[PDB]
A paper describes a structure:
The [name] monomer displays an (α/α)6-barrel domain typical of glycoside hydrolase family 63 (GH63), to which [name] belongs. While the active site of GH63 members acting on larger substrates is located in an open, solvent-accessible cleft, those of [name] and of MgH from T. thermophilus are covered by a cap domain (subdivided into A′- and B′-regions) with constrained access through a narrow negatively charged tunnel.
In the orthorhombic crystals, the [name] molecules adopt a closed conformation concomitant with the presence of two ligands, a molecule of glycerol and a molecule of serine, which are components of the crystallization buffer, at the active site ([name]–Ser–GOL). The glycerol molecule occupies subsite −1 and serine is found at subsite +1 of the active site, inducing a closed state of [name] that renders them inaccessible to the solvent. The substrate-interacting residues in the complexes between [name] variants and GG are organized in a very similar way to that of [name]–Ser–GOL [r.m.s.d.s of 0.19 Å (D182A) and 0.22 Å (E419A) for 14 Cα pairs]. In the closed conformation, this loop interacts with the segment Ser431–Ser435 (with polar interactions between the side chain of Asn23 and Gln433 and Ser435) that contains the substrate-interacting residue Gln434, which faces the active site and binds to the substrate. Substrate binding contributes to the formation of an additional helix in this cap (residues 206–209) that is absent in the open conformation.
Author numbering:
A (entry chain A), B (entry chain A), C (entry chain B), D (entry chain B): 2 to 446
The structure:
């Protein structure tokens, strides 16, 4: 009672206990009840969390996700578990099995995508496997043999179909594809989404998380579900989405993640003697999306802007996505120093009221800030992990260390919360969130 | 490859991952394949290993075991999982559901018992729960309310039915009840077991562990299975076993564990205001079995002897069971110093060829020693844990620390082996043995 | 900023750095400025803290202390550093070199004693040395050869000269001898000390600790210095002190430490083949002082009382010394359970306002409690260490572990404070106190 | 006995204990007896090791070194301790106090230089200080105010006086200036050093390290001492050395360290608002020396070569200095991949007989390899630390982590050896070497 925190070994043990408890067999749910299916960028982080425990099972997680990849290369953001209820929109609402020519056979999936963090998970699996000896290296190398082509098709689909004009930024047709559902980034684009006759429905998410301050509103869900109707009406056809979708944004954070993932996968390709044409393409996309991210940036602070394709307007908001260029590099030296000063100062990690020195999803000084409300304020362990790993890859060893130290202190309550209140540290969202346990497992070493 | 060992956090994580992987829902198998059911003293150690992870689930493990308790108080040594094959002798061979008047309804179990380590697990659960706050203490205290009477009936059955002459030692009717199946302790008693017409059978254990040097022989299994026929013939009736069983031994290690468990449970009873008559009975049995253990001891070395009830002979062997009096106390000061010198010297932990400073199941200098063969030599993590915990309770803080340190070094390969070769450290028996993971989880803290 | 605490490795490093920094060469000061000499109790703890760093230097610390032993066996509580001032009363005020027939040659010392924790340090040195191999064992064994007789003379002087009536309690002639200078324990005895013509003096301690709330009062110092005058008047003659001293108390905490120390030293004597007559005397004294401690205890609560020899009155106070019997054993079962309830309850470790679950030097509910004032309330790491070590020796592994855990949490600020405010955790007294660093070093392992 | 290794907390404690024990007051000796003075490179590492213990004392170490800076900016490689003998060549042999116009007043020093690792120490001090709060930041900032000009003069002297032709490489006039005294790197240049009438001398180093296999030969010492005679003949005059010195080499490893140090110091200059002209000069030198290092490299393997200025010949050897470009960056992508293959392959860290996955000072497959002989083969913790820190700065987090992990495993014997035998792990050179303790302290965090 005097201190409810766990020791590092207790916390590592509890994190692994959680991850195995969320394992259905060949896929791990993103949470026990709120997200009782496989999500795409959660599955990448689950593979990272499993890599210290079982390289074999980490590989199985990515194999299961890639078995659900669409014919055109798209990795969908949900792979539904057989016979599992409690989540809306479920398979019947997406109707991809009926409508989508490119949907997989004998997997049920959603019809939209999510960020390409998967190459980062492959790198972590390979790094663990190389420390474990010959039969474990064999498992990881066989996975590359089996799935290199699928990973290439995934990156190629993003580069060719969501960057049709070769601008070096990824277009999204749903805010859910950003992974930051209700981020202030998307409010002005969502204001221009006007539902027609929306088939009636009842939410499931707020039966599980009943505190309305922690989840998006009914009005937001109506817009989320209407965008599904627009996609269904064109049978999820990539060629038709630009003509019909009421939501078309370039997501600069997704773009920077893609730049990093292309560079990571290219290095893997060189190391494991994959086809040279693939490696060349990966390095070309890495630089294209780095340049595309940098082109969005504020001339004074270096902050990255999203772009509303329909309104033809830069989207200026004060969220963690502004720090996209720190992930992929490319800023002039002087502007990157400015951007780091913004990150470390009183609008973000240096805000005086924060319990931990961590990055809030929205700046506490922004008028959009809401300290409990999903992506409008709370501190997300998954983002702490991504920033710390990317910062270490920039060579910023001490910055990465500080994020990991603060992230472990926050996570030491053992709640493995989805997100945390930035001022009080109260755990929010789902407890026992898989990618929060995965962050801890990767950090503790 | 240069060092295949895991860090403490990696090892804690892997141990917890294992324990959750062996969880069928409400019972944890003793191993994945070799022991694919609940065993009684493994279940106690599983509860100890779960206590740092989930006090609720640790309590469930003991509830499941106690739901299989026999009408007369006996906790049987196996609770079979529904529909699970691969282990022999299974429920059909025991026939307790058909034959045994005292067997439980709607659980399938074996018809023999195992050591009463369960009170130790209850103590560890209570100690964890008191560090975790009010609702967790409530869970552990509700378990006491629900199961105190069952635990008393278990201890009472041992004291009244397996110590009918109030000698302060527990009589066994099968070597499997000692937990040390093929220990040299039992060879001379087993030589006086002569099977009649033994119904034919085929072993399952050595389909999984195929190296014949690691498991008991066919001849030993024939005697193990014949004792079952003798029990079935009298329908497992406690009153008839002395008249018919070809194997009747007083087990001094089981007796010392019972002395400790009675003292532990009595202290729990005082702390949680259980009935005074129960606490009195528990302290009386604690002293009775302490005295019964001491009465067996060698006048020079203090080593404890088992007793063959049929032959009316002391059984003098050089195994770890000799150190029974160190667990429960009671030796005169000079003889306990002698016994510690035997433990620490070249016949046991001080043997010059041992890889780790740990207690071999049989002395390496004994003619009975076999370095691979189950209880005839190998080092068992479960015994390391029991000795270390009991030594700490004696006040021997440094001795307990040394066993824990050496036990963690041995376990750092992450195999969670059932037992280890004493000279090479090669993992033997089943890998991913639940009570080895539980030892590690309890130690690492 | 966000977390001013140190990691275990940083804290262990800083603790060792401190201890080496307070080393004058062959003696370690108790603190850098407040206590710029060798104190007897502190030197034993310093040796414990040095044992994980250098067995050789740990031995040197005890050799230096024992080289200052008086001719009659008394270990004096201060061994002054050559040429060092800044402490009062210094050697000119004691005048033991000119007056005390039993004072050592070529060392300046005080003329009173302090608790015999030294045997505990010898045990910790031996335990470390046995893990370090042959050459290091040889160092520790040579120390035993060289100093066993001096240790016997120390224990024999306490037993024969400070327990002249064989009551099994140690008589003190100065509250400084208790180690707890201004403890409420001694108030009613000090109330009967009426100074005569007291040679003038200026305090030095409160030039260093200037906050008057943290140190004894001027009136208290006048009594401390008056007792020195009474001892000087009879030339520190043991046979004359009972006739002249205005302060004569039996210290039950000192008595319990002596019981423990005799038992510890007797076990060392058996293990290292010291003379049987010495070992027998040590076991006799251990039992005599265990019994003397038990004789002081309240028959309901077990709380131990001091005794005012002049007033022939039990001293009933609410301080940590009440728990003396927990250190040495001997209480009836029911009485010890009651005393443990008192320790863990709302008058001591369970008090709801304490920052840490640690033992305050005076109960916060006592009218005598002062949260800043030396031994009248603050939490002392040296006592946390002594209780935790003695509790582990009793077999109370979890109680010992909780004290160590809370003590490390309190110490993680790296101040190595002499004592801490019980509610706020503010560091008080001298910073960089050697026995606080020593406790941390021994704990972290 | 069974495991002579220390735990992380024990090792950190012992490392700090060592560093304080080698402290003379305001300077730390490089080792207790072999190197009983302040060395320049070692003093930077000592400051790194002191930074987690005391930012104030870490600053003092660099202040003492910089107080011995020559008038022209040169930091000499030895600052002698007052009155200390036991080292040769001592100050009487150098005669810099009488001959060297640029030598400092009130400090005795050598007359040659050593690598500019000092900026790296300043960065580590600042990083620690920023985690410690206001008063500690003020200490580190006051040091920057006081010493920024001296650090600039040090870098400017290297850039202008040891790179007179603006080739981006540092010229050495003594192999002692490289830090790698008997490296195979310098053999062909030393072969052209023919001593004249050399004033007689007796070595002191091999009175302390008596094993001749671990130290340079007598013939090598004659060349080392002859070079001193040549420098003394021209009164250590910078402008005259090119005309007279028989040894003139461009040291690519020293050059790469200088590039890194300039970049590090430039970033500090920006963060702490130092003059823009200084920051610009630092970035210019960082690029100049990065380019000079790259110009030495094999166009297939990336391996860096030294250059013999007198012979006008690239020096092709198989030592750890070949990996200079990995420290500073600048290689084309394909060439750096080749150089990393060389580092990780069977000629260096991948050699199958190495006990640890660490960088030997000379390749074990080189005909020059000698496994015991100083820089001709052994593994040096100081280099492990420098490579791991520079690798982390490159963004190679896992490579840096593997070096730290293996370095800690090697160091866990607690010898703090100067270097280790690459196959057996035997500690060699001086024990209690300060920069080995410093590496351990920085690593353990």
């Amino acid at each position: 009672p005097h201190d409810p925190s766990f020791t590092p070994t207790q916390l590592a043990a509890r994190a692994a206990y959680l991850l195995r408890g969320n394992d259905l067999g060949t896929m791990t749910t993103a949470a026990p009840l709120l997200y009782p299916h496989m999500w795409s960028w959660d599955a990448a982080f689950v593979a990272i969390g499993l890599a210290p425990l079982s390289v074999e099972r980490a590989v199985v997680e990515l194999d299961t996700l890639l078995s659900a990849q669409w014919r055109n290369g798209m990795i969908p953001h949900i792979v539904f578990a057989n016979g599992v209820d409690g989540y809306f929109p479920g398979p019947a609402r997406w109707a991809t099995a009926t409508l989508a020519d490119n949907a997989p056979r004998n997997r049920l999936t959603s019809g939209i995508t999510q960020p390409p963090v998967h190459a980062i998970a492959v790198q972590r699996i390979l790094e663990h496997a190389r420390t474990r000896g010959r039969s474990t290296r064999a498992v990881a190398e066989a996975f590359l043999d089996r799935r290199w082509g699928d990973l290439m098709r995934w990156h190629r689909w993003l580069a060719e179909c969501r960057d049709r004009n070769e601008r070096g930024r990824i277009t999204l047709y749903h805010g859910w594809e950003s992974g930051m559902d209700n981020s202030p980034r998307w409010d002005s684009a969502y204001a221009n989404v006007v539902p027609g006759k929306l088939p009636e429905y009842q939410r499931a998410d707020n039966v599980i998380i009943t505190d309305p301050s922690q989840r998006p509103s009914d009005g937001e869900y109506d817009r989320y579900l209407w965008l599904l109707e627009e996609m269904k009406a064109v049978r999820y056809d990539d060629e038709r989405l630009p003509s019909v979708m009421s939501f078309q944004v370039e997501d600069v954070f997704f773009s920077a993640i893609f730049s990093v993932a292309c560079q990571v996968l290219a290095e893997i390709g060189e190391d494991y003697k994959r086809p040279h044409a693939d490696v060349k393409d990966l390095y070309l996309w890495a630089e294209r999306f780095r340049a595309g991210v940098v082109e969005t940036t504020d001339q004074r602070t270096g902050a990255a802007r999203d772009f509303d394709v329909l309104a033809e307007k830069w989207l200026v908001t004060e969220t963690a996505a502004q720090f996209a260029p720190l992930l992929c590099g490319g800023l002039p030296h002087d502007r990157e120093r400015a951007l780091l000063k913004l990150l470390e100062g009183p609008r973000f990690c240096g805000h005086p009221d924060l319990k931990y020195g961590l990055i809030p999803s929205t700046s506490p000084v922004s008028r959009d800030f809401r300290p409990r409300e999903y992506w409008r304020g709370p501190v997300w362990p998954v983002l702490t992990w991504l920033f710390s790993w990317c910062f270490a890859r920039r060579g910023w060893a001490e910055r990465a260390r500080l994020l990991r130290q603060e992230g472990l202190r926050q996570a030491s309550d053992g709640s493995f919360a989805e997100y945390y209140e930035p001022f009080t540290g109260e755990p929010l969202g789902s407890m026992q969130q898989s990618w929060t346990a995965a962050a801890v497992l990767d950090w503790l070493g």
